[PDB]
Design a protein around this nucleic acid. Structure first.
Lengths: 17, 794, 72, 50, 49, 148, 49
RNA sequence: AUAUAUAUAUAUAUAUA
C-alpha cells in the first residue's frame, strides 16, 4: 500500500516535471 | 543408464476464466490516436472521352482502402457492425495534433500538414506533370496556423468528406476537462474534507494546461439486485472482501515485532500487569475482537447478511448478543438465525428473570420473539429496550448522489447502551422466582461483567458507528439493502471477545487507506458504466442494422467477462438472455449514438463506391444503349433501379422458395434482381456482340443456388481489343442486361482540403489523489459527529 | 525405468482427504445419471476412500428387477 | 443445450438444499443431465402422437 | 419463472414437432385409456424446462 | 520569490508550536495556499481552539478566508487575537528602490519586536485549561509551549 | 521558410539555466510572439540599415 | 558393506547432570 502509492506519486509528479 | 516409458494422457481443458478481486483491477488505459481514421483513398485511373478513346491525361478518384466487402445483402450488414466496432476502438480520448504533424515537402514557408498520408498525397500531385497549375499553387499556400494565447492550432488535411466527418467528430468531442487545485479537492468526498480529524495537504499546484478524464460515475442502470440473486451474491462477496481489507486493526492487538523486544527488556523494571482490568473467561482472545470488528463493519458496507453462530449453553454469549441486536439492525441478521438467537435471550435471561412461563415459539411465526415479548412483558425499562430492537432499522438517505444507509442517530451517539444498561440493571435486580438460586447467581455474575463495562461499551458503539460512518464516504456505487444468498458467519462467542476486551485507544481509519478504498470503488464503478455502454451500443446497433440471425449471448458473454469478478462458464444462458432484455431498453451513451448515425447515414455510400460487389443486376431482354462514362468508357451500368419488378436476394436465400424467379426467368419477364453480387469485368467487345451477358442467369433454373451468380459488366474502350468496330462503324454499343452499379467520385483537390483544429499542449493526469497528501489528528482527541471525542472513558 | 504416471499419488498427505472428495464427487454424479429411469430419494452417501455405499429409498417396494436394473 | 456445469451451479446455490433445516438425508441436485432433457423431448412427443 | 422467454420458445417447439409430425399420420388417432403406461419421470421434466 | 510548501505531521504538536513562529515571521503569501491553510487549520483545530474550549473548526476548502482570518474574528481573548491580526496581515510590501522592485518586510519584524507579541499569545495558551483534554496530555502540551 | 522557433531555441540555450527540450510548445510560441513586439537596439538597428 | 509413503481410530511406552 505504502510502496504502491509512493510509486503512484512519482509517476504523476513526473508528467509535470 | 535410463529408459523412458511414457504414455498418452488425454487432455482435459475445463471451462474457466480468471477472477480478480476489486483490489487489483487495472483502470482503462486511455486511447490516443496516431493517424487519422481513413477509409477512402485517392487513386490514379485512366480516363476515356465520349468516343471511347483513351485521353492523354489521367484523372484521380476516391476508392476504398482495403475494399473487402462480403457478398450477399446480409453479410454487408454484418460488415457494418464490424466497422462500427472498429471506429469505437480507434476513437481517442484526447487528441493532440503536435504528435501527428509531418512536414510539407514543398510550400511557401515550410509548414506542416496533419498526417504522413496526407503529405504523401500532396507530394503525389506536385510531381505529377499532368496536374493543373492551380492545383499545384494550392499546395504551396498550405501551412499551419498557430495561436499561442488560446493554444489552438489549425493544421490542413486532405480527407474524404466521409473521412472528414469521422475525424472532425474525434476532435470536438474529447473526454478532457481542465484541472487545477480547486478541482482536486472536489474529487475527495464531502464527508472527509469536511471532517475534523483529517487534515488535507498538497505541495504542487497544477498549471492552466493540465487536464484529467472524469469517470462516468452514474448509478447502475441495471438493477442487478432486482431478480438477479446469483449475480448480486458475487458482486457483494467481492465488495465484502475489499471492505474487510480497509477496516483497521484494533490498537489492543496490533504492534510491530521489535516492540515485543522493546517491551520485554523493561517489563521486569516497570511492573504493570493488571492494568488491563478485565475478568478472564475461557474462550476470550484478542484475535476474535479484531475479527468481529471487521465482520461487523465490512458486512454493513457491502450489505451481506450475517448469520449468527452460537451455542445455547453459554450464558455469556447470549448476554453479549443483547448488545449485538441493539446496534446492528435486525434486517441484516438472517431470519432463520436471528430468531433462534432472539428467542434464546427470551427463554434464558429475560423470562426467567420475571418468573414468566417460557414462550412456546413455533417455527415460522410471522412475529419475531422480541416483537412478541414487548407485548407480553409488563416492565417499563426492559420493554423500552425491546422496543428499540424491534424498530432498529437502516435509514435509506441519498447523500452526494449516492444512496447509502446511515445508522440511527442514537447509535452513533452511544445512547443505545444507556438504554440497554438501564434495562440490563433492572433485569439483574429481579428475584428469578421459578429458577433455583445458582441459576440466579450464574446470570447475575455474567450480566454484571457487562454492566461494569458501561464506559467501555458506550464507546465501542461510538467507534463502531464512526468507522462505519467514515469508510462509507469512500464508496461510490449505490448500496441497496436486499437479502443475499450466502451468509457470513459471525460467531457470537466472538462478540464477547469484542465487548470486554477493547479500551481507551481510538482506532480511526488512516487517510491513506481511505483514498485507496475510494480509488478502487471508482476504478470498478467506472469499469462498470464503460462496459454497460460498450455492450448497449452493440445490442442496439444489432437491432438497428437488421441482424435477425445474430445470437446475442456472445456480446453479453464478454460484458460479464470484462467485469473481472464474474465467472462466465457458471452463469448460464438464463442469466445472459434476461440481461439482454435489460440492456436493450437503455439509451446508448451520446458518443456512441452520434457515431453510429455517422455510419448509418452513409452505409450506402461506403457500400456503393467499391469494386468486387455490385448491388444487383437488372435484366431487360431488349436492346438498350449503355451509357458512356469517363472512367469506364462504355459500360452497361444502371444508376437507378427504376421501372422494373424487384426480387430481394437476401430473402430468396432466406426462405429459399425459388418458384417466383424460375417462373419469371423462363418466360423472359424484365426482372431487376436486388442484392450484393460479385461482378466480373469482360473488357472485350466481341463478347458483347455475342451476347455473353444474358447466358449467366440460366444456372438459377437447373440448379437452385443463387449465390453462384456473376453478372457481366462490360467495358468498351480504346485499350480493349477489337475496338475498331466502334470506331469505323457508326454504332453505339447495346446490351441486354446492365449492372446496378454506382460511379466512383472524382478527387477534386481544392474541395477536399479540411482545416483540422485541436489544442497545442495537454498533460493528461491519471489519478488525482496522488497530489493531496492527507494525515490524521492524534487519536487520543479524535472527534465524532458530536463534537465530543470518542474513547473519552478513563 | 522411468514410467510416466500422471494419476493420483497414493502416499501424499492428500491421499485420504482427497480420496474422500474425489469419490464423493464422483458418486454424486453417477447417482444423478441413473435417475433418468428410476426416481428415488437418496438418504446417505458415506465414502471412505474407494470403499463407499449410498442408500437409495424408492417409491414402490424393491423387487428382483429394480435391483438388477440398478446394478446394470 | 445449456451446459450442465452451468445450470447445476445456479440451481444448487439458489435452492441451497444442503443448508436446510433437515439433515436426516443427504440432499443434492439429481437428474439435471443432458440425457433426460433429450429423453423427455422424445417421450412427450411420441406418447402424444400415438 | 425467470426462464420464461426460453420456455415460451419450448412449447412453440414442442407443439411444432407435434404439429408437423402429425401430418404423417394415416392411421386413425383414436384416444382411449391403454393398459400399460409409458412412464415419465418428473425429474426428467425438470431437466427439459 | 520561490514558494514554499510546508511538511509536518499533525500528531507532533511540538513541531506545530514552532509552526506558530514560522507564520509570524515569514510572510503568509510565501507559502502555497493549500498548505498554508492546512498549517493554520492544524494549529487552530488542536491547540488554539481546544485551549479556549470552543468547538472544532469545520473548514470548507474553497473559502476565500484563510483559517486564522476566521478565528481572528471568533476568538474572545485579546492577547491571542492581536497575534492573529498579525499573521493575517504580514504580506510583502512592494517598494521600488534604486530602480528595482523588491518585496520588503515591515518594520515590526525587521526589529524583531513581533515575537514579543507572540510570547504574550503563546504564554496564555499555557495558562488556559484545556477543558476536555486528558490531564496527562494537557500538561504535555502546556510544557511543550513553555519550551518556546 | 525560416523557423522562428530556432531563433528562440538557442535564445534559451545561451541563458544557461534553461534546457531546450523540456519547454512546452505552448510557451515557445508565446515567447516567439512576445519577442516580435519589442523594438531593436539602436546599435543593432543602425548596423542593419 | 544394508530398503519400508500418508491419513484415521485404538493400545502400550517415554520426558530428568
Amino acid at each position: 500500500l505504502k510502496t504502491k502509492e509512493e510509486h503512484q506519486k512519482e509517476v504523476q509528479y513526473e508528467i509535470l516535471q | 543408464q535410463y529408459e523412458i516409458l511414457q504414455k498418452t494422457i488425454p487432455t482435459f481443458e475445463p471451462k474457466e476464466s480468471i477472477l480478480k478481486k476489486l483490489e487489483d483491477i487495472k483502470p482503462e488505459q486511455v486511447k490516443k490516436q496516431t493517424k487519422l481514421f481513413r477509409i477512402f483513398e485517392p487513386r490514379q485511373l485512366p480516363v476515356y472521352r465520349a468516343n471511347g478513346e483513351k485521353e492523354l491525361r489521367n484523372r484521380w478518384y476516391w476508392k476504398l482502402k482495403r475494399d473487402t466487402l462480403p457478398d450477399g445483402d446480409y453479410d454487408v450488414r454484418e460488415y457494418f457492425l464490424n466497422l462500427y466496432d472498429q471506429v469505437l476502438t480507434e476513437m481517442p480520448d484526447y487528441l493532440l495534433l503536435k504528435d501527428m504533424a509531418v512536414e510539407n515537402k514543398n510550400s511557401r514557408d515550410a509548414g506542416k500538414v496533419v498526417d504522413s498520408e496526407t503529405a504523401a498525397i500532396c507530394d503525389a500531385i506536385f510531381q505529377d506533370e499532368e496536374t493543373e497549375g492551380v492545383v499545384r499553387r494550392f499546395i504551396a499556400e498550405m501551412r499551419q496556423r498557430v495561436q499561442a494565447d488560446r493554444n489552438v492550432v489549425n493544421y490542413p488535411s486532405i480527407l474524404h468528406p466521409i473521412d472528414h466527418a469521422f475525424n472532425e467528430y474525434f476532435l470536438q468531442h474529447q473526454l478532457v476537462e481542465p484541472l487545477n487545485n480547486d478541482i482536486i479537492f472536489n474529487y475527495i468526498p464531502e464527508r472527509i474534507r469536511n471532517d475534523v480529524n483529517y487534515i488535507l495537504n498538497m505541495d504542487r499546484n497544477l498549471p492552466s494546461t493540465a487536464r484529467y478524464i472524469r469517470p462516468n460515475l452514474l448509478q447502475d442502470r441495471l438493477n442487478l439486485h432486482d431478480n438477479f440473486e446469483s449475480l448480486w451474491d458475487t458482486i457483494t462477496t467481492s465488495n465484502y472482501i475489499l471492505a474487510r481489507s480497509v477496516v483497521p486493526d484494533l490498537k489492543e492487538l496490533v504492534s510491530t515485532e521489535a516492540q515485543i523486544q522493546k517491551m520485554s527488556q523493561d517489563l521486569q523494571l516497570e511492573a504493570l500487569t493488571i492494568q488491563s482490568e478485565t475478568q478472564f473467561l475461557t474462550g476470550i482472545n484478542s484475535q476474535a475482537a479484531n475479527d468481529c470488528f471487521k465482520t461487523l463493519i465490512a458486512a454493513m458496507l457491502s450489505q451481506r447478511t450475517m448469520s449468527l453462530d452460537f451455542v445455547t449453553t453459554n450464558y455469556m454469549s447470549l448476554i453479549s448478543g443483547m448488545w449485538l441486536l441493539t446496534v446492528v439492525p435486525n434486517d441484516m441478521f438472517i431470519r432463520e438465525s436471528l430468531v433462534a438467537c432472539q428467542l434464546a435471550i427470551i427463554n434464558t435471561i429475560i423470562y426467567p428473570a420475571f418468573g414468566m412461563q417460557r414462550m412456546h415459539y413455533r417455527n415460522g411465526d410471522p412475529q419475531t420473539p422480541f416483537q412478541i415479548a414487548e407485548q407480553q412483558i409488563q416492565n417499563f425499562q426492559v420493554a423500552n429496550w425491546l422496543h428499540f430492537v424491534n424498530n432498529n432499522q437502516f435509514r435509506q438517505v441519498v447523500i452526494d448522489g449516492v444512496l447509502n444507509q446511515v445508522l440511527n442517530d442514537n447509535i452513533r451517539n452511544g445512547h443505545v447502551v444507556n438504554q440497554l444498561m438501564e434495562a440490563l440493571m433492572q433485569l439483574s435486580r429481579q428475584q428469578f422466582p421459578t429458577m433455583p438460586v445458582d441459576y440466579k447467581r450464574s446470570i447475575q455474575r455474567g450480566i454484571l461483567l457487562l454492566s461494569n463495562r458501561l464506559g467501555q461499551l458506550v464507546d465501542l458503539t461510538r467507534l463502531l458507528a464512526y468507522n462505519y460512518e467514515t469508510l462509507m464516504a469512500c464508496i461510490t456505487m449505490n448500496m441497496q439493502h436486499v437479502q443475499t444468498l450466502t451468509t457470513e458467519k459471525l460467531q457470537l462467542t466472538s462478540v464477547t471477545s469484542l465487548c470486554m476486551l477493547i479500551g481507551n485507544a481510538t482506532v480511526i481509519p488512516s487517510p491513506q487507506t481511505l483514498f485507496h478504498y475510494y480509488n478502487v470503488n471508482v476504478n470498478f464503478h467506472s469499469n462498470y458504466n464503460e462496459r454497460i455502454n460498450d455492450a448497449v451500443a452493440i445490442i442496439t446497433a444489432a437491432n438497428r442494422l437488421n441482424l435477425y440471425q445474430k445470437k446475442m449471448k456472445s456480446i453479453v458473454e464478454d460484458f460479464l467477462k470484462r467485469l473481472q469478478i464474474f465467472d462466465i462458464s457458471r452463469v448460464p444462458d438464463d442469466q445472459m438472455y434476461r440481461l439482454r432484455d435489460r440492456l436493450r431498453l437503455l439509451p446508448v451513451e451520446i458518443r456512441r449514438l452520434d457515431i453510429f448515425n455517422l455510419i448509418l447515414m452513409n452505409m450506402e455510400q461506403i457500400e456503393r463506391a467499391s469494386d468486387k460487389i455490385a448491388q444487383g443486376v437488372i435484366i431487360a431482354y431488349r436492346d438498350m444503349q449503355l451509357e458512356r462514362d469517363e472512367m469506364y468508357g462504355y459500360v452497361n451500368i444502371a444508376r437507378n433501379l427504376d421501372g422494373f419488378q424487384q426480387i430481394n436476394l437476401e430473402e430468396l436465400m432466406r426462405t429459399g422458395d425459388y418458384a417466383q424467379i424460375t417462373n419469371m426467368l423462363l418466360n423472359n419477364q424484365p426482372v431487376a434482381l436486388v442484392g450484393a453480387l460479385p461482378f466480373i469485368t469482360d473488357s472485350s467487345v466481341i463478347s458483347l456482340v455475342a451476347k455473353l451477358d444474358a447466358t449467366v442467369f440460366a444456372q438459377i433454373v437447373k440448379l437452385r443456388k443463387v449465390d453462384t451468380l456473376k453478372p457481366i459488366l462490360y467495358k468498351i474502350n480504346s485499350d480493349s481489343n477489337d475496338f475498331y468496330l466502334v470506331a469505323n462503324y457508326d454504332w453505339v454499343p447495346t446490351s441486354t442486361t446492365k449492372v446496378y452499379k454506382q460511379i466512383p467520385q472524382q478527387f477534386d483537390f481544392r474541395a477536399s482540403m479540411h482545416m483540422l483544429t485541436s489544442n497545442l499542449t495537454f498533460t493528461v493526469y491519471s489519478d488525482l489523489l496522488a497530489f493531496v497528501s492527507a494525515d490524521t489528528v492524534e487519536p487520543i482527541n479524535a472527534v465524532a459527529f458530536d463534537n465530543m471525542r470518542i474513547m473519552n472513558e478513563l | 525405468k522411468k514410467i510416466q504416471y500422471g494419476a493420483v499419488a497414493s502416499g501424499e498427505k492428500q491421499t485420504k482427504a482427497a480420496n474422500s472428495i474425489a469419490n464423493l464427487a464422483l458418486i454424486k454424479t453417477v447417482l444423478s445419471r441413473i435417475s433418468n429411469k428410476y426416481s428415488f430419494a437418496t438418504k446417505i452417501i458415506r465414502v471412505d476412500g474407494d470403499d463407499n455405499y449410498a442408500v437409495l429409498q424408492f417409491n414402490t417396494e424393491v423387487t428382483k428387477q429394480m435391483v438388477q436394473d440398478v446394478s446394470n
